[PDB]
Amino acid sequence: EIRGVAFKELFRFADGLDYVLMGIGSVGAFVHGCSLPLFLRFFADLVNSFGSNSNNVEKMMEEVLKYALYFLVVGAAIWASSWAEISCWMWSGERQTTKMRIKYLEAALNQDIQFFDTEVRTSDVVFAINTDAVMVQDAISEKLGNFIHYMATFVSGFIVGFTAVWQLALVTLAVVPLIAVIGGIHTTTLSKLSNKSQESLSQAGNIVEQTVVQIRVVMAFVGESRASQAYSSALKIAQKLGYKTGLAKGMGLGATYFVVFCCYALLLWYGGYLVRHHLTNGGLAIATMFAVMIGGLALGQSAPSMAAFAKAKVAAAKIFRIIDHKPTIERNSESGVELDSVTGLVELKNVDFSYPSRPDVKILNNFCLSVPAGKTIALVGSSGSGKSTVVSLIERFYDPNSGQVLLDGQDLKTLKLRWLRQQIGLVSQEPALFATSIKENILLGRPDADQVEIEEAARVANAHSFIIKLPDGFDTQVGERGLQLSGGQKQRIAIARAMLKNPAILLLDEATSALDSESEKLVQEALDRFMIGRTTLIIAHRLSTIRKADLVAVLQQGSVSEIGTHDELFSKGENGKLAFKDQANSFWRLAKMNSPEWKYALLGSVGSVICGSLSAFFAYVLSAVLSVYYNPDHEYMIKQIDKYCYLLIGLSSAALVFNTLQHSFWDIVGENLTKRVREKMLSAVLKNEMAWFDQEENESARIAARLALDANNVRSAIGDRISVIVQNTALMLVACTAGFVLQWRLALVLVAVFPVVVAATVLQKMFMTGFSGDLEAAHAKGTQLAGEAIANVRTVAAFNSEAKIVRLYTANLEPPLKRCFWKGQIAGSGYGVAQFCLYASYALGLWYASWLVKHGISDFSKTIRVFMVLMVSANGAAETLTLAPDFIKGGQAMRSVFELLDRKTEIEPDDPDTTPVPDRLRGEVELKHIDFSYPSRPDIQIFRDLSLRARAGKTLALVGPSGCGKSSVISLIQRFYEPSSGRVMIDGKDIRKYNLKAIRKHIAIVPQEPCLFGTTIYENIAYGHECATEAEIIQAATLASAHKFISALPEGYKTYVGERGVQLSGGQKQRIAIARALVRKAEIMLLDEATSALDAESERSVQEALDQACSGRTSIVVAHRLSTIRNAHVIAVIDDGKVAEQGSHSHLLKNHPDGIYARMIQLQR
Template structure:
């Protein structure tokens, strides 16, 4: 029976489900509506800068915001729709293994029942006329028959065990491989379709939280395809086989036991619905906290420089409060649901034994076999129903994982099925484009999709020819950046047309169009990799000669002075480089494309005077090469940078007010003249302020870069020593005292007492159940029917008491440990983020400490350490179960108990090997996933640059 008691496992709580449409992101912006939206600002901030639309050109009517729909759930068939023939074969083999593994358990129940009958049916009646020798001979004969039958049954049981081992091996291996294959496919497709969405799609998303949501969805899909899927098939097959065997051996007793199933189903349904609702809220709240972390880590230097650590930590802590509350409610409800389920099962045991007693008491015949009811027969039916009903509970983690995966897949297919108007996913049948000779805008009217009530461009018309140096100027809010966004085809105009080479831009492939355009934004976007890798992103297939030429044209001479040259790691967002250096790398990346046009979106506005002059010299050097044939389109706030432009367009509130070169426009003394005069009048005051600002900026830059340089020098000088120290620190981390971890729960220490007591009661339930089982079996062999009836009535009452105790213990233990675990998780996450803030700048320049990796680590580290509370609950329950079980075992038969103890080392070694394999695989997976997460984070956060 100990074998059957080992079937008890903790039911896992399903993964959290995130909302499909997160709230809009809040960014800081300095410019107005058009520039803010073109650079990815949120609609909330755009509202601060918006201007009233003109009365003669009413904006389209704003639709009322619809009620936020619940996340769509994909069908199970659609979840598996990306499976190919090889993956289907792996799934089929794994499914057969899982079915075999599940069916083997009811078969063992049948053999176990036969063992009971073999021990009880070989007794010999003794008559008064028989001599002692005759009685002994008959006893020996009966014993011999019993031993032969038991040997046969033992061999049968061993064969079933070998088959179970083979089936379990197939199950585990195949579902692991299937999960890896499917998750990799989903990950690649998800990444691809997200990057191919229109820029307007990103405008309506909280981009900072999007990478974490994508990764969470993929984790849920992988979780559903892996072990939990196999365990679900195993549990389902065991459930079907168990009930089939039970009804085959005796449908009358089996039917009575089925009376408990509706009660179990109601409890599971209520618990599942409650947990799902809490998970939706909890994951939504943590998505907000994750967005705060992403923003902080990407702007680490800015946060530290302005002393904003406390403010960001408070914002992060506030976002975690709701997550903590949802987790606590989740713990209590799950504990109550699990306790209720086991209580109903125990009630069913009592009912089955009581009904079996009435059958035997009344000498009724088993209608399924035509023979009298035997104790072994009743016990086999009981255990088959026991396993079948228990497997209903084991289905819970698999069902929750599948439901979570379907929710995640619903979001995946929602994005996949979304057909971008600008981008093209799949085979693009539009015209190809080798080069661009001319851009034209004709009567263009444009509203940003995120703010359709604000008109940005109002009947704008202009033309740009290749080989020209064109500048677009105007006050903030005039629509300068929007013009460039339309030329890049980040958006399509609401009315009017954008022509390329005299044809509508929409007739050309978007990728081909952007391949002809080099783009450099106000804030240069660099990825967390080497300088060479960042430049090669402009044209991965470029030759070495083209690479060298682009670097020379962009004046990247400073790279030769770096220790690693072009292999120098630039850090997250290029944090290890100055603004001018980053901008020149971005220009080199754009030049490597050998594009027809180079777009410069205020490429020098965010730089100091020295860096601005250097970048302007680089731009002038590029434009002065007559054989280049490249057109340069500049959006400029500082008019001093556009004096040499061949053509200047002046915009005001989305309309073209005048155009010409610098001299012509100055002679007109119109809008351009007024802009120049305004800037020149304040130039002296600005210069004085710039001198002071430059001095402060240089000192701050030197201080920050000094830390980075110092860290790099130390790493190079003491590389071996630091590696040894790092190894020691890693080893030390694995030896953290338990008291230090539990100190994070100091305010909640009073909850440890009821939590431990509840776990002890919960753990003792199964060993105490064996007392009732043994008592019931002994009662069945008694010849005195009244004594049998009295004993079985008492045992049935004992089952009821055990069930109630299990309900109480499970609710208290899971609820209290949820309080402890959620409190520890919240404090750990805040403390880890605090520690990240306290690190020197060189720490964040390390390739292993990019924002994406640190954000993922922040999520995983705290969660894994917080599982300490769950492990304490599991250990307390296991300790209680072991102590109570050993006490009862030695009390009944110490010889048999010692024999069974001899098998414990074998099970320990087997479990240790299994854990080592799983931990090794998990470590490798985590390292690979962390790198992949960083790539996703960089790409999604800078989707506009990636698409350009």
């Protein structure tokens, strides 16, 4: 394998326009990166002009106007540079990516079947088509532009810092690694603890998934409380892990706050020292500190670019490996002969095409097809010596081992290999349709034909009137994924696309779509009476296409057996808008649910406020220090700077303490809330009906994913998100108050430009995240078509529609190209306008500060303090606004959770108050006039007003046929599916009114395909009773003949078992389920087919265990029970739920059971 190619090789599909776009985007990214430190330098110059000229009001006003003009120039430069970078990079990346997808699909479909058998697999090719978005649509589309932009920012910030104040820049460059390593430690610890918590949540999801896959026994054996308790224990483990995670996150980010505040205290003291020694200015000091931080952040932000570049190198190496391979199929003449008789006879001296994956195996040894012209020849044989290899031979897949295949005295190997393809028709087992129009999915057989030939191609063969009468319309883009759910329409569309093709050398490889409907009847009229005759190796049915064919040509052991007469039989084993009032109500309900932890939240809230306030205070101090930088009194300057540094150290200590407090307590309340939510969701789902678990969207994997995702989503929505909202609200409040009390009418101006600043900063955050959306979703349709074409590469090569598929792929990928260009242009223009308005607002604020100072309304100190404090307030508001979409997502998860919780259940496992039940029952049950009881699929209605009787202390051994409601009478007994017309009376009264959980504690079951959950067989057996103890388990194991086999292993009771455990035999788990049913010790017992596939001694042991269970008390056994039913008084015999005579095993009345019950026994004997 290859670990990657050269980075430049990723640009192999860049034409002149792509080169121009890349150059323009690179220049724009470089200038946009350099602009921000240049703006810091210009801010330093403006502040120096605005503070150092306090006495000369005219000079400072003129210089402030000049530097506001420079701010406008920088804003325009950022506008142009960001527009260029974003739009050009996105467009060039999209163009190169689309060119690569087109070329890759063409190259892949141009290869032979060998390249997808022993070289790169079909799944690998589809995955490469998927991850072309990851490779080229990501790394060189925008990540390259971001890399250039951030490297430019880093270099420009370093240059600005080291040209303004090199002393302060050097000490700041020394400082930056401290914050970097503190943040790295915090991120590492947080990621590790989050991974551990995620593993705990995954284990909890495994627990709930195991609960719902085995819901049939969990509901029956009143194990819902046990499952809830186990889930709660797992959730408590995950909650302790989340507590550790929250404490670690709070401590780490409080350490970051403490370190940055202390470092700013040191840097501000050193800047005061530099101003005191007349080395530089205060504005220069602030700007050089900020510029070195911006350079450090820029250098840190180019790591994702390098990660994307490495991933791109490896994935481009893969894609180039597929593309650059020259197919061996086209190494032949490709132009030899294309003028042969349409009625051709394929001759095979020796069969070949031993697949290159396993060249040692020779499935086809030696035989000849010797097909008749105009007469249909069939083949049949075993699966191991299959017939599809003959199809591969005929279609010239170029794998000749020893012999050679030739058509009517002309070698296929030396043939054109182009004309042969349309000469040879094909309808394989797979329909192999494509995500394109139905007309195209037929037209691709003969491209030159118009709609008319398509019409008679779909008319002569099969019926196309379904398409005409299709509610979608005359033309259809194969619906969504496939036109037909059944597959008959798919097969007949394939037949029509072969009809536009030449059927001269037709090949029909049967149909694996389970067609046993009128689709086969229509197939009888399509390509079963066609005038010519060639290989039709249909083996779906014995008489289908074989009885009518004049040559059976049975194939076995890679050689043709007796051929010609079809009368002889062949031995084989073949079978034959959205209102937010509802969201607010849901949030209030969730908060009421989270009442017990409100106190904790409140403390965390307090911490948030403090931290919020702290930030403002810090900004204030910083701005205040700047005012002290421009002060003629040196001693007063030193005293004020030292006071501010000490206050800032105190702020750092408070920031650490209250950050740990806020985040620890907010994560504590979030963990408690998500644990409570998960527990309530589990209770709600376990309170539902069995039909609810039957539904597909409530599947086990679906349920686990839904629960985990919803809980995680709301957790964030309620934790760090609300933390940040409260913190930023406190910051904004404190900042506005400080600005207004210092110098109003300028804070009013900054509030006037407040929306501009918050919008521009939100767009800055978006740019940091990335402006290109979901790359895979953008090319979803083209990716789907490419994957379908790759999976059906055999059909594409057979119909010679490689060019048509590639052209359809270009037509599918053009709209994403146009959309990406337009999105890039809109994003670039919007981002540039936002930045220009931001810098215009900054210039306006500083000029208004100058105007207030010149008029004598205010002073420099108050103006600069208000300005900086309001700017940090705007930054906090930006954070809140950019976190709003997570609030939207959390509201969606919240309404999902509260629609799951508030769903009502028809059946109540834990009834509030019902008719009390005695400790021991009689066992008599009457299922009078029962019905199908299957809401999920009401198409079928079994139990046509059927009634069933079970006398107290007696057994029923009903047998029935397969799929006659055999395994559903017990479901009616346990109230899994409520019978609408059925009266199920237990102990003389209906089960609907007694305590359901109490009865389910008094009825045992041995389900068909026995449930083997848990980790140890000991717990599986103990599941039968709450007070399992040890004597009960031992006696149950002994009674059901389940003690010797378990003790055979050294582990015995404490043995690894379950879904992830060691797989054991069916008889062992059946007897384990029987032992669990016995240890349940129930008056009414329900059995199933516990003898599906067992050896002689295991069969005898299972029958003995069943005999003992029946001898115990009242029981219902529904197994086949061909003999030795222990003389049940009655046996219920039914035909699809209809009323029928109850033929007994002893055959007292040998009239009804003679033709039903005894027939299967005679057949098996």
